[PDB]
């Protein structure tokens, strides 16, 4: 237990599976979706990861 | 991007098109018709096509 | 995410075995499926809830 | 996101400076702006993101003939913010005309701070109703912001004036300012000086430094209202998501406030729920039922017993409510704020849309109508006379507040399915 | 021989042109044959088709459409047992399933 | 390779002498030319490869009626260079005629230095727009070099004149000199004395020794522009590779300059990128979008975070840009220069092709047109009258700068796929 929770940080993963995947960090999501409006209003036939990857960064 | 990828072959193709482009426009001179239009058409169509392909390798 | 987070938070922070942590995370993740409408029984209820999200975006137009 | 705070008038500059001292002591902030060795939390709501985290408050001070601004000056918290946004009678007409003549350079101060900001989301006006220099000037300038920026939110912190009427034009000043609060503002929080003085004489035997104590009270109010933003919470991290639940009608934006610990010199959440449901924990003084009630709590809670608390308070049916429509009491929870002394660990604060405020409006209506029929309490200001020869702006405001009283009373009726 | 009749029947069916003596029929038929003869695509990668089918199954399970996921897997597994398979699959596809998770009303 | 530097006029000789003092202090150079005990780097751009590394600057000083040249004389840096390339009114006509009468021997000085050089790549003119003795003489002599050497590059360092109009023929002088800058020069860097004085009053309270301070500023500019050459860098070790990215049109060669530290009395590259993207770090004063922006940086950087910086500045979309065409912001990096005191370790410099300069051109156009319609501000020079009886050279320059303004505004349009 002692090595798994510090050298590979088993707890912080559960913490960041909660903040993001369970959407527990709500501060991130509102500015994310605020910046994400022009992308999502375009149909994703014309969306790619290169449009996505760093509006991620402005949000972060 | 020297490791053998599809990407690397595309980059080599761009370089060879650039070399053939340089050879024509260098010897051309100041603007003059020297039967240049056919070679020009092949060259500009090649640049447009391959640059369009390079927007498909951006993801 | 608050009563649930409490249950998971106890069953890891005391747990003196890896296998107890594993099965603490397990039942927690499965329980959130039953609290929401993503269960096998509640698919119809989820359809009802989808039908009330249609009018919200409709009201925008 | 980024909200720019406005402080004006003697009273508004007082509670604004006190609240900035509150947030400097609250977060890990030096009196110079320097991030301290105990500072994490969300620090960009009013805090300028400087390099060494000089969290400079977005605080714009604009008045004329400075008196209390000198008292703000001799302080180390004049080094907390100064991006040069600090700027150097007691009637509505005089303040209106004085705001008219210098509107351009102070609006340039507004614009400079606006483009200097990353974004703009709200105007928070530190004010008091008929606050002397604040009145007239604030209504005028509020019209300038609402005309100039129609895409932003207005919250006006003010108190109901009770000075035991001496200025006799005060119902006129409050009536015109209240007109501007109806048509140029989207949220107005008013509090009774009477009921606050009653609570002050209730908990202790001090009523004489009333200015200093009321600064503590409304600074606790405003820090508690913004605590979910300034410390990482989950919801109402926008102002607009908080405002939307309270308002079914964009002219009914006047809210009642209450605070659950009346002494500060803990227990479960059902208990504070029952406490806040009593009208003696309320800071504000026929049948009146609330439209929608929402509460913020900060303290040491049981995360399952809040469900049980709403369950028992519901099945108690300890309240009435309004005929027209499904609303609820609404719970909201955040952290108990660190880095301050934490006494009486549960502190709750309530925002409710109540029809009882229409009686308070009618009191001011009756006062204005009485002084209007007597017509010896305007003192014939020449600025008021050239501003309005017939004084029908006061007639139009009285029409507006009467329409609001009609909306209040028809909202008391189940016929607010029909028009109010 | 049957090819030509099939391309005519396709024009009639999809384009809604049931009269071969309409000039628009012959224009659509000439367009269809000239499109078939303009070889401009790579041949079908069976592995890419399999990856897309599996991903469609994943999208159904991610959306908790269990009946649609189980039917998707079952039908694709049965059809892929006795080249032209992957052809017809890509052909139908071009994107994915329409009516996103709301077409699981299997009678039988 | 080998570039010969030209200094002329009072202003141009000032910043040229200051810049040669800058490069003498910068590299391991004595005031006599002797290589010092701390000198490696590329030292053949302006430096004569003598035997004992007497790195003699390729500095040709040509004027008439020497005043500031005497101040250059009483100095040990008159022993740095003298291959006998130093040569002994304020109007365009007077300077033009004076350059006409002695063009032959000073062009012999040019030719002697040219064949004395190993190669020739560029003419760097130290100048100011309407620089008194520099104006007229410089436009004439620039025509002589462009006719005589058409295979070389012309960069003209000059400043926009602001002397608060006194010479009244100054818009005529600048208009004719600007014509010669359009048709006989391939790059013109101009800077506003107004904005530089604003930055000088901004960082400190000194504006009175403006000549001395502006010498420091443009000497930092020019050393930073040539640092990638004079110290071993990777690219833009030719002038032409630097010039090619900026220019899509050989008449639009007028560039805006900015400098990221405004105080000198460090941090990451994303930060200076955001700083330089602000228009208050710019040394120069409708809708205007840049054609192409390129930046040089010198300092202590993280070599991976420059990728991250371009990534975040791109996805911020903190700029606009031009409709017609794929350009970019362009990063360029070199060493922080040794052997000088290194304060505020990151110093960045930007070259951008902006359409905002067309307004500045239109200001001078309106001034010239006003004085032309009045027609009392040419003072009837006899040299100007015999040089041009109808003064249609000024009409032709006004036509040229109007064509450039049209090219600027159609380049603002997406229809610069069509003609501008």
From Swiss-Prot, chain A:
Protein family = Belongs to the TUBGCP family.
Name where it's found: Cytoplasm, Cytoskeleton, Microtubule organizing center, Centrosome
Q: How does it assemble?
A: Component of the gamma-tubulin ring complex (gTuRC) consisting of TUBGCP2, TUBGCP3, TUBGCP4, TUBGCP5 and TUBGCP6 and gamma-tubulin TUBG1 or TUBG2. TUBGCP2, TUBGCP3, TUBGCP4, TUBGCP5 and TUBGCP6 assemble in a 5:5:2:1:1 stoichiometry; each is associated with a gamma-tubulin, thereby arranging 14 gamma-tubulins in a helical manner. Gamma-tubulin at the first position is blocked by TUBGCP3 at the last position, allowing 13 protafilaments to grow into a microtubule.
List the expressing tissues: Ubiquitously expressed.
Q: What is this protein called?
A: Gamma-tubulin complex component 3
Task: Note the superkingdom of the native organism.
Answer: Eukaryota
User: What is known about what this protein does?
Assistant: Component of the gamma-tubulin ring complex (gTuRC) which mediates microtubule nucleation. The gTuRC regulates the minus-end nucleation of alpha-beta tubulin heterodimers that grow into microtubule protafilaments, a critical step in centrosome duplication and spindle formation.
Q: What is the source species?
A: Homo sapiens
Swiss-Prot record, chain B:
Localization (cell): Cytoplasm, Cytoskeleton, Microtubule organizing center, Centrosome
Q: In which tissues is it expressed?
A: Ubiquitously expressed.
Superkingdom assignment: Eukaryota
**What disease has this protein been linked to?**
Microcephaly and chorioretinopathy, autosomal recessive, 3: A disorder characterized by congenital microcephaly and chorioretinal dysplasia associated with poor vision and nystagmus. Variable ocular anomalies include microphthalmia, retinal folding, retinal detachment, optic nerve hypoplasia, absence of retinal vessels, round areas of chorioretinal atrophy, and attenuated electroretinogram. Most patients have mild developmental delay and mild learning difficulties.
Function, as annotated? Component of the gamma-tubulin ring complex (gTuRC) which mediates microtubule nucleation. The gTuRC regulates the minus-end nucleation of alpha-beta tubulin heterodimers that grow into microtubule protafilaments, a critical step in centrosome duplication and spindle formation.
Q: So what family is this one in?
A: Belongs to the TUBGCP family.
Name of this protein: Gamma-tubulin complex component 4
Swiss-Prot record, chains D, F:
Q: What is this protein called?
A: Tubulin gamma-1 chain
PANTHER family documented for this protein = TUBULIN
Outcome of mutating residue 360 to P: In CDCBM4; the chaperonin-dependent folding and hence the yield of monomeric gamma-tubulin is compromised
Q: Which organism is it from?
A: Homo sapiens (Human)
Q: Name one GO molecular function term.
A: structural constituent of cytoskeleton
Name the gene that codes for it.
Answer: TUBG1
Q: How is it modified after translation?
A: Phosphorylation at Ser-119 by BRSK1 regulates centrosome duplication, possibly by mediating relocation of gamma-tubulin and its associated proteins from the cytoplasm to the centrosome.
According to the entry, the disease involved is: Cortical dysplasia, complex, with other brain malformations 4: A disorder of aberrant neuronal migration and disturbed axonal guidance. Clinical features include early-onset seizures, microcephaly, spastic tetraplegia, and various malformations of cortical development, such as agyria, posterior or frontal pachygyria, thick cortex, and subcortical band heterotopia and thin corpus callosum in some patients.
Location comes to: Cytoplasm, Cytoskeleton, Microtubule organizing center, Centrosome; Cytoplasm, Cytoskeleton, Spindle
Give the Phosphoserine positions (modified residues). 119
Q: Which InterPro entries match?
A: Gamma_tubulin, Tub_FtsZ_C, Tubulin, Tubulin/FtsZ-like_C, Tubulin/FtsZ_2-layer-sand-dom, Tubulin/FtsZ_GTPase_sf, Tubulin_C, Tubulin_CS
Keywords noted in UniProt: Cytoplasm, Cytoskeleton, Disease variant, GTP-binding, Lissencephaly, Microtubule, Nucleotide-binding, Phosphoprotein
Curated annotation (Swiss-Prot), chain E:
Q: Can you say where in the cell this protein is located? A: Cytoplasm, Cytoskeleton, Microtubule organizing center, Centrosome
Annotated tissue distribution: Widely expressed, with highest levels in heart and skeletal muscle and moderate levels in brain.
Quaternary context: Component of the gamma-tubulin ring complex (gTuRC) consisting of TUBGCP2, TUBGCP3, TUBGCP4, TUBGCP5 and TUBGCP6 and gamma-tubulin TUBG1 or TUBG2. TUBGCP2, TUBGCP3, TUBGCP4, TUBGCP5 and TUBGCP6 assemble in a 5:5:2:1:1 stoichiometry; each is associated with a gamma-tubulin, thereby arranging 14 gamma-tubulins in a helical manner. Gamma-tubulin at the first position is blocked by TUBGCP3 at the last position, allowing 13 protafilaments to grow into a microtubule.
State its role: Component of the gamma-tubulin ring complex (gTuRC) which mediates microtubule nucleation. The gTuRC regulates the minus-end nucleation of alpha-beta tubulin heterodimers that grow into microtubule protafilaments, a critical step in centrosome duplication and spindle formation.
Which family is this protein grouped under?
Belongs to the TUBGCP family.
- What name has this protein been given in UniProt? Gamma-tubulin complex component 5
Q: Which organism is it from?
A: Homo sapiens
């Amino acid at each position: 237990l002692d090595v798994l929770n510090k050298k590979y940080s088993l707890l912080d993963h559960m913490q960041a599976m909660r903040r993001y995947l369970l959407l527990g960090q709500g501060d991130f999501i509102r500015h994310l979706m605020d910046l994400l409006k022009p992308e999502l209003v375009r149909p994703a036939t014309t969306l790619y990861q290169h449009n996505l990857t760093g509006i991620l960064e402005t949000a972060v | 991007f020297i490791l053998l990828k599809p990407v690397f072959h595309c980059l080599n193709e761009i370089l060879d098109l650039c070399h053939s482009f340089c050879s024509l426009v260098s010897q051309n001179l100041g603007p003059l018709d020297e039967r240049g239009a056919a070679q020009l058409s092949i060259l500009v169509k090649g640049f447009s096509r391959q640059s369009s392909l390079l927007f498909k390798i951006l993801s | 995410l608050e009563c649930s987070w409490d249950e998971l938070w106890n069953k890891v922070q005391q747990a003196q075995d890896l296998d107890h942590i594993i099965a603490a995370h397990e039942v927690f993740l499965d329980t959130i499926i039953s609290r929401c409408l993503l269960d096998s029984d509640s698919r119809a209820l989820l359809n009802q809830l989808r039908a009330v999200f249609d009018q919200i975006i409709e009201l925008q137009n | 996101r980024e909200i720019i705070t406005l402080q004006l008038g003697q009273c508004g500059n007082q509670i604004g400076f006190e609240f900035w001292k509150q947030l400097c002591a609250e977060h890990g902030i030096s009196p110079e702006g320097i991030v301290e060795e105990f500072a994490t939390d969300r620090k960009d709501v009013f805090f300028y993101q400087a390099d060494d985290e000089h969290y400079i408050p977005r605080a714009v001070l604009l008045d004329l003939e400075p008196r209390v601004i000198h008292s703000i000056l001799n302080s180390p918290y004049a080094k907390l913010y100064n991006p040069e946004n600090i700027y150097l009678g007691n009637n509505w007409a005089s303040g209106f005309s004085q705001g008219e003549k210098i509107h351009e350079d102070i609006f340039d101060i507004i614009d400079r701070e606006a483009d200097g900001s990353d974004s703009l989301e709200g105007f928070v006006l530190c004010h008091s109703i008929a606050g002397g220099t604040g009145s007239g000037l604030g209504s005028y300038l509020l019209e300038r912001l609402n005309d100039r920026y129609p895409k932003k939110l207005v919250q006006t912190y003010s108190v109901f004036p009770n000075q035991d009427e001496d200025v006799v034009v005060q119902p006129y000043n409050s009536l015109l300012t209240l007109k501007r609060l109806t048509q140029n503002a989207d949220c107005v929080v008013v509090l009774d000086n009477t009921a606050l003085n009653r609570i002050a004489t209730d908990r202790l035997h001090i009523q004489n430094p009333s200015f200093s104590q009321i600064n503590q009270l409304v600074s606790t109010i405003m820090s508690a209202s913004t605590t979910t933003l300034r410390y990482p919470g989950y919801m109402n991290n926008d102002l607009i998501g908080l405002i939307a639940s309270l308002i079914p009608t964009p002219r009914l934006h006047f809210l009642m406030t209450g605070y659950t610990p009346l002494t500060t010199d803990k227990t479960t959440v059902l208990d504070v729920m029952r406490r806040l449901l009593q009208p003696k924990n309320v800071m504000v003084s026929t049948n009146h039922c609330y439209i929608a009630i929402l509460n913020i709590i900060q303290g040491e809670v049981d995360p399952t017993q809040v469900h049980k608390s709403l369950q028992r308070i519901r099945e108690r049916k300890l309240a009435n409510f309004i005929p027209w429509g499904p609303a609820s009491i609404q719970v909201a929870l955040s952290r108990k704020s660190p880095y301050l002394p934490s006494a009486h660990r549960v502190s709750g604060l309530m925002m409710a849309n109540h029809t009882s405020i229409s009686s308070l409006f009618e009191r001011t209506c009756r006062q204005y109508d009485k002084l209007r029929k007597r017509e010896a309490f305007l003192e014939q200001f020449r600025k008021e006379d050239m501003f309005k020869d017939n004084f029908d702006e006061m007639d139009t405001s009285r029409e507006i507040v009467q329409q609001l009283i009609d909306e209040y009373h028809a909202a008391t009726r189940p016929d607010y399915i029909s028009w109010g | 021989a049957q090819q030509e009749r099939d391309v005519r029947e396709l024009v009639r069916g999809v384009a809604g042109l049931q009269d071969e003596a309409d000039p628009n029929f012959q224009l659509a038929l000439n367009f269809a044959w000239s499109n078939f003869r303009f070889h401009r695509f790579l041949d079908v990668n069976s592995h890419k088709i399999e990856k897309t089918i599996e991903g469609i199954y994943e999208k159904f399970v991610i959306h908790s459409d269990l009946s649609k996921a189980a039917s998707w897997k079952r039908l694709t597994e049965e059809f892929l047992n006795a080249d032209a398979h992957y052809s017809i699959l890509s052909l139908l596809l071009c994107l994915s399933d329409s009516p996103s998770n709301s077409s699981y009303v299997e009678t039988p």
